[PDB]
């Protein structure tokens, strides 16, 4: 089906305590597979998924060299940003970047990405054409001119249209047994009295993959999203996710409420109700 590969990076300056902290992780779909943390004597990128451990030493060597180079460039970039914004070296700042690609079922590129954020806000991002830039403010406009003059877009586009897609296809085949398998959610409805006149109906979805899913509560077939409490999809810690939706109903109306679950791992949408 449709898949993606994403590399996330975060550098945080640490005034008076040492060099900035640099942490980067790579994901294929919702599966984390590589990590690098600068907080070590001799840090190296490490595997986080079984299907990537088979890569040879040259792979880890190159990845580690790239990670170390990115940490250094980030340190220089943080210094540049302090000048662009006339900020003091005594304050902590954060620089984030994410880049990756999406491939359709045919294995061909669907969309590429490359975007930066400074202090949690959009800084500069590569447009969908993978050839032009969108700057968020005057400071990012300085970077844009520099990147336009240095033909940065064409270099990123070459990587995003080539290696990004080619290596994503490689990982998808090696991890086929898990990355190309959708784990349907295990579902059930729980009942929790709030008083003698009201009760909470909670619809659960557990151990599912990927993370995308839709949970809705209906009363007599009418969507109750306005009165539905929906928690953010959360990780179980075993690579699968969990989510639940709840509604408060007047005691005695419970059997009129049905929970609707939609997940790519389910052949058809599921309808569930409280079964005491």
């Amino acid at each position: 089906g449709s898949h993606s590969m994403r590399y996330f990076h975060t550098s945080v300056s640490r005034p008076g305590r040492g060099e900035p902290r640099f942490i980067t992780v790579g994901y294929v779909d919702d599966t984390l597979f590589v990590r690098f943390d600068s907080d070590a004597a001799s840090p190296r990128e490490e595997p986080r998924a079984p299907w990537i451990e088979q890569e040879g030493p040259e792979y880890w060597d190159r990845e580690t060299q790239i990670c170390k180079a990115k940490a250094q460039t980030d340190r220089e970039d943080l210094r540049t940003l302090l000048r662009y914004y006339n900020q003091s070296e005594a304050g902590s700042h954060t620089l984030q970047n994410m880049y990756g690609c999406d491939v359709g079922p045919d294995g061909r590129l669907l969309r590429g990405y490359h975007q930066h954020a400074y202090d949690g806000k959009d800084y500069i991002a590569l447009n969908e054409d993978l050839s032009s830039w969108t700057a968020a403010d005057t400071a990012a406009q300085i970077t844009q001119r520099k990147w336009e003059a240095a033909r940065v877009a064409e270099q990123l586009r070459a990587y995003l249209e080539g290696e990004c897609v080619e290596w994503l296809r490689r990982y998808l085949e090696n991890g086929k047994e898990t990355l190309q398998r959708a784990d349907p959610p295990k579902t059930h409805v729980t009942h929790h009295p709030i008083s003698d006149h009201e009760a909470t109906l909670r619809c659960w979805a557990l151990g599912f993959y990927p993370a995308e899913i839709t949970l809705t509560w209906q009363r007599d077939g009418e969507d109750q999203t306005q009165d539905t409490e929906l928690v953010e999809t959360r990780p179980a810690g075993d690579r699968t996710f969990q989510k639940w939706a709840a509604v408060v109903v007047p005691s005695g109306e419970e059997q009129r409420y049905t929970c609707h679950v939609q997940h790519e791992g389910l052949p058809k949408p599921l309808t569930l109700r409280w079964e005491p």
Binding site: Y7, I66, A69, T73
Partner: peptide, 9 residues
């Protein structure tokens, strides 16, 4: 695998 970034903002 990752892309190379040697210099850069």
């Amino acid at each position: 695998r990752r892309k190379w970034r040697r210099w850069x903002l």
